[PDB]
Design a protein around this ligand. Structure first.
Ligand code: CLA
Ligand code: CLA
Ligand code: CLA
Ligand code: CLA
Ligand code: CLA
Ligand code: CLA
Ligand code: CLA
Ligand code: CLA
Ligand SMILES: CCCCCCCCCCCCCCCCCC(=O)OC[C@H](CO[C@@H]1O[C@H](CO)[C@H](O)[C@H](O)[C@H]1O)OC(=O)CCCCCCCCCCCCCCCCC
Ligand SMILES: CCCCCCCCCCCCCCCC(=O)OC[C@H](COP(=O)(O)OC[C@@H](O)CO)OC(=O)CCCCCCCCCCCCCCC
Ligand SMILES: CCCCCCCC(=O)O
Lengths: 73, 740, 165, 147, 74, 142, 40
C-alpha cells in the first residue's frame, strides 16, 4: 500500500503543480522518488515549528515525528 | 619457574589433505554434510579453537599463529596503500599545493561509464578523493617522492611474507609450549620496554633526523623536489646544523646532561603550527622521546629469571580489604589460564583507546594540512569511534564466554568475582534505574522543547535563550586548561589545544582549529550520550552476570553461550543467553555511536569549520547548532534533511558513487528486518514447498535445504542492520563534507 | 508512432540531450592540458557518447518528449514495426541460456545421485564431470522435450513426500 | 487469589501474573473460545454485537454533522467551495500558546480550528444540504437511529 | 481531500484483506471437517497446496528480481 | 523405602549470602528444601548464583523454585555423584516429599508406578478440532 | 596434488573461479562492444 499511495500522490502532485514531466522522468529511477518526492515535499512539513516561529502546519510536523517514535518503539 | 624458550619440534605436519576435508577441526562437522546447515556451521565454528580441543597448549599455538596471519594481511593492506599512493596517486602534486589540491589515490577503469568516478581532484589527476589521511601522514614522515612510497610498499610485502612464514613456522615447526605463553611478567616487561619504549625511541630517531628537517624545509617554501634527500641530513651534519644549530655540538650536550642545548628540535611549544595547522613536529619528537624513557623503565618492574622485580600474583593477592572479602586473589590464574578473560579486558581498553585517540587527534590535528582537510578529519573521527565501539561489545561477549566456559566455582570462593556474581541483582537493578532516569532526564527535555516550540511557547523551552542548562563543569575545565600554560604548566608556551580557547588557527583561508563553546544543546547532547553509554553497558553487563544462571533458567551454564532459548514455557524464554545480550548490545552501540558522530558532524560544521573572512568566519552552516539542536526536529530539518542534499544530488558527479551507496545502504538496513522480525518456522515450511517443486522436476539437491538457525537469523539481521546504517552515514558524511 | 513515441532520430530532445551532454564534458576538457591523460580520457568519453547517442537512433529507438529511448514489449508491435531487437529477441536469448544452466545442473545432480556419497560431491564439486556436462546443455530444448514425450522430466506423485494436509 | 476480570476465561481469571489483564482484553471478542459457549448463544451474542457496531457508526456520523454545524463554515464554504476551506472542529487546547492560537485561526473563524480532509462538506453539498440546520436535523436523526 | 480519501480507503482495504485470509486459516483449523469435505473443491486445494504456494513463490521472485533490477540499472 | 521426613535442624552449607535467593513468595506462597549427604567439605556452585562450601555429612538448602532444587540435585548426582532429595514446605509447614517420591529416580523403571497422561494412539490419530468444537476439550486429551 | 586439486574443487573455490570468468567475459564484451542497449 505504501508504494501505491506514494504513486498516487506523486503522479497527482505533479499533475496539480503542472510539472507532469517531473514525474514522467524522476519516477523512472528510485533516487527521483526520494529527493524529488519524499525530500522535496517534506521541506514545508518539517518547518511547521522552527527556532523563528510556528505556523498552522505545526501539528503535522509534531505528528510526523510522533509517527517515527511509535514506529521505532 | 625459570623463564626460558620452550618449543616442540615439528608438531603439526604441512599438508593439503586436511584442506580437502572440510570440518576436520570439529568432531561433529567431520562426518560431512547432510543438511545445508553444516555449510554455515563450518564457518561459525572455525576460529573457536577452545571448542576444537581441550588442550590449552594447542589452543594457544593456534591463537599465536593466527595473530601472525592477521599481521600479514595488515602489512599487505598497508603495502597496497603505499603502492596505490605511489603509482595511482596525486601525492607529489598535492605536496606542492596541499591546500587547493584534494588527495586522491584510487583510479577506476574506463568501463561501464564508471570512469565518471575519476573526478578532477586537481593536479593533472582524475581519481577518487580519499579520506584516509595518508597523504598528510606521509608528508609528516618526510616522504617527498613516489620512490620512497614504492620502496615502503615493497618492504611491507616482504614483512607480510615473514609474518605468514612465522605463523607456519611457530605452528607446524617450532610450536611454543604452554609454559612459554604463560610468562605474563616476561611479555609485559618486553612489550612495555622493547615494543612500546623502543618503538617510540626508534620513531623519535626518524622524527629528529628525517621528519623534522624535511618538514621545516617544506614549510619554508622550498620545492619538494629540491629538498636534500633524508640520508643527507644524517651524513651531512652541516645541513642539519643549519636547520638546527644544536647539531653543531653533537651528542655531547646529552651525555654532559646539557639537554637544554637541544631546545631547537625538542620543544614544549604547545598548540598548532601556524603554517600547516598541525601540532609542531618538534613537540611530537620530544613526546616520543619522553614516552620512550617511561616505557623502557616500566619494562623493569615485573620479575623474570633473576631476582629483582614484582610478582603480579603476589601484588593482586596483597590488594584485599575489609569489604571485598579475599580480594583480587584468584584473578591471576584466570588471566594466565584463559584467553577469553584476557581478550575481554584487552578489547575493552583497546576499543576505548580508539575513541580517545579520535577525540585527541581531531582536537589537536597531529599531521600537517590535516585540520583544513575537513573530510579527512570527519572520516577519521567517525571511523575510530566505531572501530572502538565494536571492540567494547566484543569485550562484553568474550567476558560472558569465559564465565560460561572457563569459570570454576572452586577457585573463586570469596573473590571480588564471586562477591559480584552474588549481588548481580543490586548492580543490575541500580543500573536499570539510572538508565530510566537518564532517559527521561535527557530525551524528555527534548520532547518538552519540541512540544513547547510547536505549541508556540518558545520562552518555555530548555535553551540558552530560555530555561538554560549550561555545562558549567565542562566550561570551567576548558578555562583551567586555557590559562594552564601561564600557571599550571609555565614551560608550555601555549595551551594543549585551541578547543579550550584562544585565537582561531587559519591555514589557507580555512579554520584549522577554532575554540569550541559548550552551551545548553551541548549539555543536552552530552547527557544523551551518557544515557546510551549506560544502557549499552546494562545489556552487556547483564549478560555477563547472568551468563551462567538466573531466577529464570537456573542452569544456563549447562546450556551454553550461543543457545537460542530454553523453551516457549515459563511465559517464554527467548534470548536468555549471553550471545543474545551481545546481539542487542550491538544495536544500542550503533544508536549510541550514531548520535556521537552526528553531534561531531553538526557541532563542528556549525562552530569550527569555515572560511576566515575579513572581520569574521563563515561556518559551513552559519553557527546554527546552538538554537537548532535543542529539539529533535532541528536534528532532522537542519541536520539530516538539510545536509542530505549533497548525497541525494551526487548523481552525475564524481560523488555519484556515494548517492548510489547511500540508497544501497538503506536497502541493506531494511533487508535486515526480515531476519530480526521473523522466524525459521515460516521459512522452513516455505522451503518445504519449494523442495516439492524441485522434487517434482527431479532437480532436488542431495544436501537437505534447511532454514537458518534461530541464532543465525539473529546474527544475519544485526549484521545487515549495522552494515546498512553505518554505510548510509558513511555516504552522507563523505558526500556532504567532500562537496562542501 | 506506436504510442506517441517519436523516433530518437526525429526526437529534438534526444538531440539536445546530446548537445548538452557533450558540452558538459567539453567544459571538463578545457581545465586540462591537450595531451594529459585526463584529457585523452575525456575525449574518449566524448567520442563514446557521440557513438552511443547515434547507435541508438540508428536502431530506430522510439523515445518520448523526455528524449530517452523506450522499448516495445508486444511481439506483434515489435515484429510488425521492426522493433524486435528490443525485449523480444533478447527474451529468447536469456531463456536459452537460463534453461541451459538449469538443464546442465539437473544432469549433474542426477549423476551424483546414486554415486557413493552424493552429499560430498555437492560441496567438493567434481570439476571433471561438471566440465563434461556443461556442453550437453547446448541442445537442452531437444532433450527436455524428448523427456516430456517419455514421462521422465518429472517424478510420480506417489514418490514425493508431502506435508500433512 | 482467583480474580473476576477474565470472566470468560477462568484460566486467565486464576492467572497469578499480569498477563490475565492483557489477554482478558484480547480473548474478549473470541466467544467461540469462551468458557461454556453454545453455537446458538455465539450467534445471538454476535448478532447483538453487530447492533452495537451499528450504534457507534451512526453516533460517529452524528458527531461529525454536529461539529460541522456547531463549529464549521458549511454555509460560507458552500458560497465559495473553491476558496473557503471546510472547518472540521475547533481546537480548545488549554496548553496552546498565543502564536498557536493565532496560526490555527483559518478557514474564517474566531478561534483556532481544524480544516477537514474527510470531504464530508463536498458530499453533503452534492446531496442537498445547504444550511447548518440540515446538519443539526441529520445529527439528531442519526443519533436517534443509534439509540 | 482527494489524496487523504484515496490513502484512507486503500489502507483500510489492505487491513480488511489481511483479515479475510486470517479468518480463512482459522476456518481450516477451528471449523473444517476433512471427512465431509472429501474430494470437494475445498479439499482438493490442500491436495495441490504446494503447487499453489510454490507457483506464488516463482511469480514473486520473478517480479522482485526484475522490477528492482530495472530500477537499480536506471 | 519410606518417604524421608525433613529434619529442619540439618547443618546448612557455608555461604555468605546473595541478592538472589528467596522473596515474599517463599512465605506468602511456598518454598522448597533440598537435602543431601556429602563425603567431604567441597565448594559447589549455587543454582541461584555464587559458590558455597558443602559441609561433611548432612546438608540442607532452601529455594523458591523446584527447578533450582532439581538443578542442585543433578549437580550433586553428577559432580559429586550424591543422591539429593527435596520437599515443598508450604506456608502452614506442610512438607511434601517432591523427589524422587518413590525412591527410584524417575528415569529408572520401577513396578508400582501407574501410567498417567499416556495416550495409546499415534500422535497423528488425534481427531479434528471441529469434532471437539464447543466441547471445551483438547483434541489430544479427547 | 590430488588433495590440492580436491581443495581447488570445493564449492567456495569453484564458485570464485566460475564467477570471475563470467564477470570478466561481460566486462571484456562491453570493453570492445560498449553501450549494448539493443540487439539491433
Ligand atoms: C602454506 C602451507 C600450509 C599448509 C599446506 C597448511 C596445512 C594445514 N594447516 Mg596451516 N598455516 C599456514 C600454512 C599452511 N598450512 C600458515 C602460513 C599459518 C599461519 C597463519 C597457518 C596456521 C595454521 C593454524 C592455526 C592451523 C593450521 C592448520 C592446518 C591443517 C588443517 C587446516 C587447514 O589448513 O585447512 C585449510 C584452511 C584454510 C584454507 C583457511 C585459510 C586461512 C588462511 C590462513 C588465511 C585466510 C584468511 C582470509 C583471507 C580472510 C579474509 C576473507 C575475506 C577476503 C572474505 C593443515 C594440514 C590447523 C591444524 O593444525 O589442524 C587442526 C590449525 O589450527 N594452520
Ligand atoms: C623486546 C621483546 C618483544 C617485543 C618487541 C615483542 C613484540 C610483540 N609481541 Mg611479544 N613476547 C615477548 C617479547 C617481545 N614481544 C616474550 C619474551 C614473550 C614470551 C613471554 C612474548 C610473547 C608474545 C605473545 C604470546 C604474543 C606476542 C605478540 C607481540 C606483538 C603484538 C601484536 C601486535 O601489535 O602486532 C604489531 C606488529 C608489529 C609492531 C611489527 C613488529 C613485529 C616483529 C617482527 C615481532 C618480533 C618480536 C620478536 C620478539 C623478535 C624476534 C624475532 C626473531 C626470533 C626472528 C608484538 C609485535 C602477539 C603476537 O604474536 O602478535 C602477532 C602475541 O600473541 N608476544
Ligand atoms: C581480537 C578480537 C577478537 C578475537 C580474537 C575474537 C575471536 C573469536 N570470536 Mg569474537 N568478537 C569480537 C572480537 C574478537 N573475537 C568483537 C569486537 C565482537 C563484537 C562485534 C565479537 C563478537 C563475537 C560473537 C557474537 C561471537 C564471537 C565468537 C568468536 C570465536 C569464534 C569466532 C568464529 O566462529 O569465527 C568465524 C568468523 C566468521 C563466521 C566471520 C563472520 C562473518 C563476518 C563478520 C560478516 C562480514 C562482515 C563484513 C563487514 C562484510 C563485508 C561485506 C561483505 C559483502 C563481504 C573466536 C575465538 C563466537 C563465539 O565464540 O561464540 C561462542 C561468537 O558467536 N565474537
Ligand atoms: C523510539 C524507539 C524506542 C524508544 C522510545 C525506546 C525507549 C527505551 N528503551 Mg529501547 N530499544 C528500541 C527502541 C526504543 N526504545 C529498539 C528498536 C531496540 C532493539 C535493539 C531496543 C532495545 C532496548 C533494550 C535492550 C533496552 C531498552 C531500554 C529502553 C528504556 C531505557 C530506560 C529509560 O531511559 O527510560 C526513559 C523513557 C524514555 C526515554 C521514553 C521517553 C518517552 C517520554 C519521555 C514519556 C512521556 C509520556 C508522557 C507522560 C505522556 C503520557 C501520556 C499518557 C496517555 C501515557 C526506554 C524507555 C532499556 C530498558 O528497558 O530500561 C533500562 C533496555 O534494557 N531498549
Ligand atoms: C503477453 C500478453 C500480450 C498482450 C497483453 C498483448 C496485447 C496486444 N497485442 Mg499481442 N502477442 C502476444 C502477447 C500479448 N499481446 C504474443 C505472445 C504474441 C505472439 C503470438 C503476440 C502477437 C501479436 C500480434 C501479431 C499482434 C498483437 C497485437 C496486440 C495488440 C492488439 C491485439 C489484440 O487485440 O489482442 C492481442 C493479440 C494477440 C495476443 C495476438 C493476436 C494478433 C492480433 C489479434 C492481431 C491484431 C492486429 C491489429 C493490427 C491489432 C489492432 C490493435 C489496435 C490498437 C488497432 C494488443 C495491445 C496486434 C498489434 O497491435 O500489433 C500491430 C498484432 O498485430 N500481438
Ligand atoms: C541446478 C540448479 C538449479 C536449478 C535447475 C533450479 C531450478 C528452479 N528453481 Mg532454484 N535454486 C538453486 C538452484 C537451482 N534451481 C539454488 C542453488 C538456490 C539457493 C540460492 C535456489 C533457490 C530457489 C528458490 C528460492 C526458488 C527456486 C525456484 C526454482 C524453479 C523456478 C525456475 C527458476 O526461475 O529458477 C530459479 C532459481 C533461483 C531463484 C536461484 C537459483 C539460480 C542459480 C544461480 C542456478 C543454480 C546453478 C547451479 C549452482 C549450477 C550447478 C552446476 C553443477 C555442475 C555444479 C526452478 C525449476 C523457485 C521455485 O521454487 O519455483 C516454484 C523459487 O522459489 N530456486
Ligand atoms: C467484522 C470484522 C472482524 C471480526 C468480527 C473479527 C473477529 C475476531 N477476530 Mg479478527 N481481524 C479482522 C476482522 C475481524 N475480526 C481484520 C480485518 C483483521 C486483519 C487486521 C483481523 C485479524 C485478526 C487476528 C490476527 C486475530 C483475529 C482474531 C479474532 C477473534 C478474537 C479477537 C477479537 O475479536 O477480540 C479483540 C481483538 C482486539 C482487541 C485486537 C487487539 C489489538 C487491536 C489492533 C487494538 C484495537 C482496539 C480498539 C474474533 C472472533 C484472533 C483470533 O483468531 O482468535 C484466535 C486473532 O488472532 N483477527
Ligand atoms: C527492504 C526490506 C525487505 C526487502 C528488500 C524484502 C524482500 C523480499 N521479501 Mg520481505 N520482509 C521484510 C522486508 C523486506 N523484504 C520485513 C521487514 C518483513 C517482516 C518480518 C518481511 C517478511 C517477508 C515474508 C513473510 C516474505 C518476504 C518475502 C520477500 C521476497 C519476495 C519475493 C521477491 O520479490 O523476490 C525477489 C528477489 C529479490 C528482490 C532479491 C534481489 C536479488 C539479490 C539481491 C541479488 C543477488 C545477490 C547480489 C549479486 C549481491 C548480494 C550478495 C553478495 C554480497 C554475496 C523478497 C526478495 C517472501 C519470500 O520469502 O519470498 C518467497 C515472503 O515469504 N518478506
Ligand atoms: C600452487 C602449488 C602448490 C603446491 C602443490 O600444488 O603441490 C604440493 C604438494 C602436494 O600437495 C599436497 O601435499 C600434501 C602432503 O604433503 C597433501 O596431503 C597431498 O599429498 C597434496 O595435495 O606437496 C608439496 O610439495 C608441498 C608444497 C608446498 C608449497
Ligand atoms: C563508586 C566508588 C566506590 C568507592 C569504593 O571504591 O569503595 C572502596 C571499597 C573497597 O573496599 P576494600 O578496602 O575492601 O577494597 C580493597 C581491595 O578490594 C582493593 O582495593 O569498595 C567496596 O567497599 C566494595 C563496594 C563497591 C560497590 C558499591 C559501590 C556502588 C557504586 C557503583 C558505581 C556507581 C557510582
Ligand atoms: C582511596 C582510599 C584509600 C585507601 C584507604 C586504606 C586504609 C588502610 O589501608 O588502612
Amino acid at each position: 500500500i505504501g508504494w501505491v499511495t506514494f504513486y498516487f500522490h506523486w503522479k497527482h502532485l505533479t499533475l496539480w503543480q503542472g510539472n507532469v514531466s517531473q514525474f514522467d522522468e524522476s519516477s523512472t529511477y528510485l533516487m527521483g522518488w526520494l529527493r524529488d518526492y519524499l525530500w522535496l515535499n517534506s521541506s514545508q512539513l518539517i518547518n511547521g515549528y522552527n527556532p523563528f516561529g510556528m505556523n498552522s502546519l505545526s501539528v503535522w510536523a509534531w505528528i510526523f515525528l510522533f509517527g517515527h517514535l511509535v514506529y521505532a518503539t | 619457574k625459570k623463564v626460558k624458550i620452550a618449543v616442540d619440534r615439528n608438531p603439526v605436519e604441512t599438508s593439503f589433505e586436511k584442506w580437502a576435508k572440510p570440518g576436520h577441526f570439529s568432531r561433529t562437522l567431520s562426518k560431512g554434510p547432510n543438511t545445508t546447515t553444516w555449510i554455515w556451521n563450518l564457518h561459525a565454528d572455525a576460529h573457536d579453537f577452545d571448542s576444537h580441543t581441550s588442550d590449552l597448549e594447542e589452543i594457544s599455538r593456534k591463537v599465536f599463529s593466527a595473530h601472525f596471519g592477521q599481521l600479514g594481511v595488515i602489512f599487505i593492506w598497508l603495502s597496497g596503500m603505499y603502492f596505490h599512493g605511489a603509482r595511482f596517486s596525486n601525492y607529489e602534486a598535492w605536496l606542492s599545493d596541499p591546500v587547493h589540491i584534494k588527495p586522491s589515490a584510487q583510479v577506476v577503469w574506463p568501463v561501464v561509464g564508471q570512469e565518471i568516478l575519476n573526478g578532477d581532484v586537481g593536479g593533472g589527476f582524475q581519481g577518487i578523493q580519499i579520506t584516509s589521511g595518508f597523504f598528510q601522514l606521509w608528508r609528516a614522515s618526510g616522504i617527498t617522492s613516489e620512490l620512497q612510497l614504492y620502496t615502503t610498499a615493497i618492504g611491507g610485502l616482504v614483512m607480510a611474507a615473514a609474518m605468514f612464514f612465522a605463523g607456519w613456522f611457530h605452528y607446524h615447526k617450532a610450536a611454543p609450549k604452554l609454559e612459554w605463553f604463560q610468562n605474563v611478567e616476561s611479555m609485559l616487561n618486553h612489550h612495555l620496554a622493547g615494543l612500546l619504549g623502543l618503538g617510540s625511541l626508534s620513531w623519535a630517531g626518524h622524527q629528529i633526523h628525517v621528519s623534522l628537517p624535511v618538514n621545516k624545509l617544506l614549510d619554508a617554501g622550498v620545492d619538494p623536489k629540491e629538498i636534500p634527500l633524508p640520508h643527507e641530513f644524517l651524513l651531512n651534519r652541516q645541513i642539519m646544523q643549519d636547520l638546527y644549530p644544536s647539531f653543531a655540538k653533537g651528542l655531547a650536550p646529552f651525555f654532559t646532561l646539557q639537554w637544554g642545548e637541544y631546545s631547537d628540535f625538542l620543544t614544549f611549544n604547545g598548540g598548532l603550527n601556524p603554517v600547516t595547522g598541525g601540532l609542531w613536529l618538534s613537540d611530537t619528537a620530544h613526546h616520543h622521546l619522553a614516552i620512550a624513557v617511561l616505557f623502557l623503565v616500566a619494562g623493569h618492574m615485573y620479575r623474570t629469571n633473576w631476582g629483582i622485580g614484582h610478582s603480579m600474583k603476589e601484588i593482586l593477592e596483597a590488594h584485599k580489604g575489609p569489604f571485598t572479602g579475599e580480594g583480587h586473589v584468584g584473578l591471576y590464574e584466570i588471566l594466565t589460564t584463559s584467553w577469553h578473560a584476557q581478550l575481554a579486558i584487552n578489547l575493552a581498553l583497546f576499543g576505548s583507546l580508539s575513541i580517545i585517540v579520535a577525540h585527541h587527534m581531531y582536537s589537536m590535528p597531529p599531521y600537517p594540512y590535516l585540520a583544513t582537510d575537513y573530510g579527512t578529519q570527519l572520516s577519521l573521527f567517525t571511523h575510530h569511534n566505531w572501530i572502538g565501539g565494536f571492540c567494547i561489545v566484543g569485550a562484553g561477549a568474550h567476558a560472558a564466554i569465559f564465565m560460561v566456559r572457563d569459570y570454576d566455582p572452586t577457585n573463586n570462593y570469596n573473590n571480588l568475582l564471586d562477591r559480584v556474581i552474588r549481588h548481580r541483582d543490586a548492580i543490575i537493578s541500580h543500573l536499570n534505574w539510572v538508565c530510566i532516569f537518564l532517559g527521561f532526564h535527557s530525551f524528555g527535555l527534548y520532547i518538552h522543547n519540541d512540544t513547547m516550540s510547536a505549541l508556540g511557547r518558545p520562552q518555555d523551552m530548555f535553551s540558552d535563550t530560555a530555561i538554560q542548562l549550561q555545562p558549567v563543569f565542562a566550561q570551567w575545565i576548558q578555562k583551567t586548561h586555557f590559562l594552564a600554560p601561564q600557571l599550571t604548566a609555565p614551560t608550555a608556551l601555549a595551551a594543549t589545544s585551541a578547543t579550550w580557547g584562544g585565537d582561531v588557527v587559519a591555514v589557507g583561508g580555512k579554520v584549522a582549529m577554532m575554540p569550541i563553546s559548550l552551551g545548553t544543546s551541548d549539555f543536552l547532547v552530552h547527557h544523551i550520550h551518557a544515557f546510551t553509554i549506560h544502557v549499552t553497558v546494562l545489556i552487556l553487563l547483564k549478560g555477563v552476570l547472568f551468563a551462567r544462571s538466573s531466577r529464570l533458567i537456573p542452569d544456563k551454564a549447562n546450556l551454553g553461550f550461543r543457545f537460542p532459548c530454553d523453551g516457549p514455557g515459563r511465559g517464554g524464554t527467548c534470548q536468555v543467553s549471553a550471545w543474545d545480550h551481545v546481539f542487542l548490545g550491538l544495536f544500542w552501540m550503533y544508536n549510541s555511536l550514531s548520535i556521537a558522530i552526528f553531534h561531531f558532524s553538526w557541532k563542528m560544521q556549525s562552530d569550527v569549520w569555515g572560511t576566515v573572512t575579513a572581520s569574521g568566519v563563515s561556518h559551513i552552516t552559519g553557527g546554527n547548532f546552538a538554537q537548532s539542536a535543542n529539539t529533535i526536529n532541528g536534528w532532522l530539518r537542519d541536520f539530516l534533511w538539510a545536509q542530505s542534499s549533497q548525497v541525494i544530488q551526487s548523481y552525475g558527479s564524481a560523488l555519484s558513487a556515494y548517492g548510489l551507496m547511500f540508497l544501497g545502504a538503506h536497502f541493506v538496513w531494511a533487508f535486515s528486518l526480515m531476519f530480526l522480525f521473523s522466524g525459521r518456522g515460516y521459512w522452513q515450511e516455505l522451503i518445504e514447498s519449494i523442495i516439492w517443486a524441485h522434487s517434482k522436476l527431479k532437480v532436488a539437491p542431495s544436501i537437505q535445504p534447511r532454514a537458518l538457525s534461530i541464532t543465525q537469523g539473529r546474527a544475519v539481521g544485526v549484521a545487515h542492520y549495522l552494515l546498512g546504517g553505518i554505510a548510509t552515514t558513511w555516504s552522507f558524511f563523505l558526500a556532504r563534507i567532500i562537496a562542501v | 508512432d506506436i504510442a506517441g513515441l517519436t523516433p530518437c532520430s526525429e526526437s529534438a530532445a534526444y538531440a539536445k540531450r546530446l548537445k548538452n551532454e557533450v558540452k558538459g564534458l567539453n567544459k571538463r576538457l578545457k581545465n586540462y592540458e591537450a595531451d594529459s591523460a585526463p584529457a585523452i580520457a575525456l575525449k574518449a568519453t566524448i567520442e563514446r557518447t557521440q557513438n552511443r547517442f547515434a547507435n541508438y537512433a540508428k536502431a530506430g529507438l522510439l523515445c518520448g518528449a523526455d528524449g530517452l529511448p523506450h522499448l516495445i514489449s508486444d511481439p506483434g508491435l515489435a515484429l510488425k514495426y521492426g522493433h524486435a531487437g528490443e525485449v523480444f529477441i533478447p527474451t529468447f536469448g536469456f531463456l536459452y541460456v537460463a534453461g541451459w544452466i538449469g538443464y546442465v545442473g539437473r544432469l549433474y545432480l542426477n549423476m551424483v545421485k546414486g554415486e557413493a556419497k552424493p552429499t560430498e560431491k555437492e560441496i567438493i564439486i567434481d570439476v571433471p564431470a561438471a566440465l563434461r556436462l556443461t556442453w550437453q546443455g547446448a541442445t537442452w530444448p531437444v532433450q527436455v522435450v524428448a523427456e516430456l514425450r517419455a514421462n521422465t522430466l518429472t517424478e510420480k506423485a506417489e514418490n514425493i513426500t508431502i506435508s500433512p494436509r | 487469589a482467583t480474580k473476576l476480570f477474565p470472566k470468560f476465561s477462568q484460566g486467565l481469571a486464576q492467572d497469578p501474573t499480569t498477563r490475565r489483564i492483557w489477554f482478558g482484553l484480547a480473548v474478549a471478542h473470541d466467544f467461540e473460545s469462551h468458557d461454556g459457549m453454545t453455537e446458538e448463544n455465539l450467534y445471538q451474542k454476535i448478532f447483538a454485537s453487530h447492533f452495537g457496531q451499528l450504534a457507534i457508526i451512526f453516533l460517529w456520523t452524528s458527531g461529525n454533522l454536529f461539529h460541522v454545524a456547531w463549529q464549521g463554515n458549511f454555509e460560507q464554504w458552500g458560497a465559495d467551495p473553491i476558496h473557503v476551506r471546510p472547518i472540521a472542529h475547533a481546537i480548545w487546547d488549554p496548553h496552546f500558546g498565543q502564536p498557536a492560537v493565532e496560526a490555527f485561526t483559518r478557514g474564517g473563524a474566531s478561534g483556532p480550528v481544524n480544516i477537514s480532509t474527510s470531504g464530508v462538506y463536498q458530499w453533503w453539498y452534492t446531496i442537498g444540504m445547504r444550511t447548518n440546520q440540515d446538519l443539526y436535523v441529520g445529527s439528531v436523526f442519526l443519533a436517534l437511529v443509534s439509540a | 481531500t482527494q489524496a487523504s480519501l484515496y490513502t484512507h480507503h486503500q489502507y483500510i482495504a489492505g487491513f480488511i484483506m489481511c483479515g479475510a485470509f486470517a479468518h480463512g486459516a482459522i476456518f481450516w483449523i477451528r471449523d473444517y471437517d476433512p471427512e465431509q469435505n472429501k474430494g470437494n473443491v475445498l479439499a482438493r486445494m490442500l491436495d495441490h497446496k504446494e503447487a499453489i504456494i510454490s507457483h506464488l513463490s516463482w511469480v514473486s521472485l520473478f517480479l522482485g528480481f526484475h522490477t528492482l533490477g530495472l530500477y537499480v540499472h536506471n | 523405602w519410606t518417604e524421608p521426613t525433613l529434619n529442619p535442624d540439618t547443618p546448612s552449607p557455608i555461604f555468605g549470602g546473595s541478592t538472589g535467593g528467596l522473596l515474599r513468595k517463599a512465605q506468602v506462597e511456598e518454598f522448597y528444601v533440598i537435602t543431601w549427604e556429602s563425603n567431604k567439605e567441597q565448594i559447589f556452585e549455587m543454582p541461584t548464583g555464587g559458590a558455597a562450601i558443602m559441609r561433611k555429612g548432612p546438608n540442607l538448602l532452601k529455594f523458591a523454585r523446584k527447578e533450582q532444587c532439581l538443578a542442585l540435585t543433578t549437580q550433586l548426582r553428577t559432580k559429586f555423584k550424591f543422591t539429593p532429595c527435596f520437599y515443598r514446605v508450604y506456608p502452614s509447614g506442610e512438607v511434601q516429599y517432591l523427589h524422587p517420591k518413590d525412591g527410584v529416580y524417575p528415569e529408572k523403571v520401577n513396578a508400582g508406578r501407574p501410567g498417567v497422561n499416556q495416550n495409546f494412539r499415534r500422535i497423528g490419530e488425534n481427531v479434528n478440532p471441529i469434532k471437539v468444537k464447543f466441547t471445551g476439550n483438547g483434541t489430544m486429551d479427547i | 596434488m590430488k588433495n590440492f586439486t580436491t581443495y581447488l574443487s570445493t564449492a567456495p573455490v569453484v564458485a570464485l573461479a566460475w564467477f570471475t570468468v563470467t564477470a570478466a567475459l561481460l566486462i571484456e564484451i562491453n570493453r570492445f562492444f560498449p553501450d549494448p542497449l539493443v540487439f539491433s
